[PDB]
């Protein structure tokens, strides 16, 4: 919900994250402007903003989202976010604070 920012650009995501402190684990999710069927997880780690592409995929008629080409699959963006609030996965840190 509050972590989803719609169709904002990468530069805007970096400005929003910088404006709130550059704290480790601060994050937002945005629609990818360069992949229209994808999303981007923008995350602050070690006073730097990183961006992780989330792509949809289909296996046996089942749709899912993944950041690692289907090694870890999620039914929706909420499930991906909730998983990574407790598990790092391929991310360098946990998702800790939602960027307003």
């Amino acid at each position: 919900q509050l972590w989803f920012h719609g169709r904002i650009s990468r530069e805007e995501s970096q400005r929003l994250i910088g404006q709130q402190g550059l704290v480790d684990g601060l994050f937002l999710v945005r629609e990818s402007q360069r992949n229209p069927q994808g999303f981007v997880l923008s995350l602050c780690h070690l006073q730097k903003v990183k961006h992780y592409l989330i792509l949809p995929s289909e296996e046996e008629g089942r749709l899912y989202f993944s950041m690692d080409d289907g090694q870890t699959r999620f039914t929706d963006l909420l499930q991906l976010v909730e998983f990574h609030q407790l598990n790092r996965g391929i991310l360098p840190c946990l998702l800790r604070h939602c960027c307003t």
Binding site: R34, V40, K50, H51, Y52, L53, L55, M67, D68, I90
Partner: peptide, 8 residues
């Protein structure tokens, strides 16, 4: 990996 992103 994905060009232009930090996924690893």
């Amino acid at each position: 990996k994905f060009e232009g992103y930090d996924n690893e």
